[model samples]
Target chain A: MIVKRPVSASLARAFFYIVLLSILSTGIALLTLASSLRDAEAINIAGSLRMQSYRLGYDLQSGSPQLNAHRQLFQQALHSPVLTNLNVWYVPEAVKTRYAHLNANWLEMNNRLSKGDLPWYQANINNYVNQIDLFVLALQHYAERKMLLVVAISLAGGIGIFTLVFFTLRRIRHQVVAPLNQLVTASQRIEHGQFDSPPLDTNLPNELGLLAKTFNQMSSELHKLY
Target chain B: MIVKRPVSASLARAFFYIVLLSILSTGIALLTLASSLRDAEAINIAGSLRMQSYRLGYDLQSGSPQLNAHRQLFQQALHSPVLTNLNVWYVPEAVKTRYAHLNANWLEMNNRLSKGDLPWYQANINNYVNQIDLFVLALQHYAERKMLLVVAISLAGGIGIFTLVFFTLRRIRHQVVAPLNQLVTASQRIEHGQFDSPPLDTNLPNELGLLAKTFNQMSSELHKLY
Candidate 1:
């Protein structure tokens, strides 16, 4: 009952699963890294909104001719495809909230630019720009978190394979190497005409057990002839 | 000569080096992650300078009594230990340059503030804040680069060990399993009173070679008795 499985079957199964695990972990790490490739772009767009807010404030203060162009650019940058993606379900609530706040503040600031409330814009521009910086920080944190997951997954896969290798080696020494050494010793005795050597334990759960059983029967019949 | 090394020796050496590589890569990932632990803090400090710059501009225009307090706070935040560390030798040149520019611009703007040049300060505040944003972007890029290295090392380590395991399994099947199967078949034939079984190959480079040679000698002697 203890010798139910063959050696090849057991080793094949172990190796197959270990290889599968290695592939799975590597795929996950790659995909996770891929997801964050646009992170720098997102952060840059968000950060630029800060400069644009200050630029709009300056334009309103100095009555610059380029005020309309700068205002339109700020609006376009705020709703760029990369940042608008944060409104989707998968993005963290904090990031979505920050982005929403930035959008709302820009809308209010845009209206003030039209109303020519230069004093209101000067006092509140710092707060609106601060919102943009906070949004950028959130994006940075999300990207960093993805990187952490990649590291953890890789570490886990390495440790998993390493542990399996350790145990596999130990099993080979016990079930394969040690038993093969015993058979070699018994044969050496038979070669020297000493047919009465102690019998090999044939309880191994593998091809070696069949080999040992046949070895014992061969040695017994040879002894009968002598 | 092709079988110069023993099975255990070959397998042991391969596994040893694979484990060593795993440890080395894991250590590197951990150290790289640790180095970036303060990255968020650095970015926050750098970002706060943008807010401080705007606040200072507001104070100057509105004749706020807290102008001196806001001015000193901007100086303190700019020289904070986390942000100032970017000036060291190991930090990237781009990052250092950005930080230096932010500092120089702030110093000039501070002098203009003292001289009561409201026109100059309002005209240049957007440019100055843009410098702060650029400095923060450089820090973000540096942190992201470190993360990329960690992912790269982990992927390499995973693929390396996976390849080793594949080769090791193939070797075990060829050198260990095939030879043992041969010996088992030979023993089964001899057990059936057929001592003239085709001779098993004795050219293995390990313990099994010795076993095959001994098996052949024992079978030859048994044939002589019959």
Candidate 2:
């Protein structure tokens, strides 16, 4: 049968950290998984759209002899620039819009050809296709790399949360449970100004360390006050 | 500025649990995906087998006019009771041999026909094909269902592990942090036997419940002994 439990600041602190870390772990895991799913989805959608647009471009490019590989690739560049947040951070809107306009021009040209105008529509558009292809390739690469980075980060964050929670709970159990049990019996001698014991010097590191020191000092001060 | 960082035993324990949960979640997620994939695969494989087997069985029964659907379904029923565990749970030797026999029977029927036996070749092999079809249907259903169950279990286990870890850590942290901090600060006074600062009966539950109860008890015993 257990009689008295101990009062331990160390144990208390340990409990707090354990809970905090756990919450952190859960949040991070959910976020990581969600983010990964999102990345996969976004990339898949983008890939599909690109493929469709490319097919359209191919139909048009095939008509023009001048729209060589380089030229066709350039023409394909007429799509959106800076999908979502891929824009240069902190750039003025006007400057960013210049690229946007460039993208619009090529997109417009393809859009027109797509409206049933044959592939051999214009020489300039062919040249633009090649440039567009280069841009598309780069955008694809960027999205892929960016997605990978985000996934990696999310995983690391989740792992870190779980690790912290584990260590925290373990510390609390050892530092708190035993000491708390011990503190109970130790607290009883208080009427006589004699809360002294070897267990009093649990002397474990961190919060427990400060706890032991405090207990020893408190005994001295309390005896004086009494 | 404090140079040294504070660490606690509880924090470590919590961190450990968090990591364990995370690893578990990842494992479960993969298991779930794999099981679903397996289900899709099983359906494709078994569907064709059953349909072909059934058609062959019909041909055999009608050609000879010797058996009906009921007889076909009951073919070898006494000798071929389906034993439960597949590939495991230690099936009996007889069951294993019988299963092999059925399989071989299927092969012979198919092969003999391939050798150009005759028009009745279809009739000759129909019974075997029918039985195989019936069994294959059963087998595929079981396989598909098992895959779903496995996937569900894996996913639930993983999520459960991670959730438990997170919540437990949080609960411990919330319950322990304040107590530990308080104890750490007051431990010094308690060490000196200063029992009167906060009246024993001032009566905060955890603080009053604990707060050096053991130390005080020990002090009384020591005084009596002395």
- In order of the candidates, what TM-score does chain B achieve? 0.86, 0.45
* Model 2 stretches with alpha carbons more than 4 Å out: A1-169, A179-182, A190-199, A202-207, A222-226, B1-101, B104-116, B123-135, B182-208, B212-226
- Candidate 2 interface RMSD (Å): 12.9
Model 2, B1-226: lDDT tens per residue? 1112123344455455556655665455444443333222222233333333433333342353432442344333323323222334333344345456666675565555445344444345446545544544444444434334433543454456556655654555445554455554445554455545442222233433355343345344433434
TM-score of chain A of each: 0.87, 0.42
DockQ of each: 0.36, 0.09
Residue A172 of model 1, lDDT score: 80
Model 2 chain B worst lDDT run, 10 consecutive residues: B1-10
Candidate topping DockQ: 1
Using alpha carbons, what is the TM-score of model 1? 0.85
Q: iRMS of every model, one decimal? A: 2.7, 12.9
